[PDB]
């Protein structure tokens, strides 16, 4: 797994983009394969959210995630709140 | 993989329980474990889908599955149209 201060960094970054759009951010797993990295997440949103709205979330998720922390690939599992 | 009319059978009972629920279903893949066996396929649904109700549906399917054909397990990931 990827070290605890990174994790934090990863969580507060998370937040902040997911404003307005999502919920909660829980079941946070990492791990790392030298120059590459991975991250898994379940993103709760409203249960009324368009499945393509969050769709195009993870997406921009992964992007963000992309570029702020190289070499991180990201899996987003969508989860209606409840 | 399970026999292949079996597969076929599986394919037009997903079509026919996803009628005025989702759009399509595809890449169908299953595997055989003795008396289990397992099934993950895509589940297409319109953009506007609520995701409480994608996984409404999904719950749905799975459950429909297993008693439909015994010892079946399925996973299923949610996908927006185009």
């Given at each position: 797994?990827?070290?605890?201060?990174?994790?934090?960094r990863?969580?507060?970054?998370?937040?902040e983009?997911?404003?307005?759009?999502?919920?909660?951010?829980?079941?946070?797993?990492?791990?790392?394969?030298?120059?590459?990295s991975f991250?898994?997440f379940h993103?709760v949103?409203?249960?009324?959210?368009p499945?393509?709205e969050?769709?195009?979330?993870?997406?921009e998720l992964?992007?963000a995630?992309?570029?702020?922390f190289?070499?991180?690939?990201?899996?987003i599992?969508v989860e209606?709140?409840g």
């Amino acid at each position: 797994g990827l070290p605890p201060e990174e994790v934090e960094r990863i969580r507060a970054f998370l937040q902040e983009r997911i404003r307005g759009r999502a919920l909660e951010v829980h079941d946070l797993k990492t791990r790392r394969a030298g120059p590459r990295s991975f991250l898994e997440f379940h993103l709760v949103v409203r249960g009324d959210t368009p499945v393509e709205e969050a769709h195009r979330l993870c997406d921009e998720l992964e992007r963000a995630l992309a570029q702020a922390f190289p070499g991180l690939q990201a899996t987003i599992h969508v989860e209606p709140e409840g």
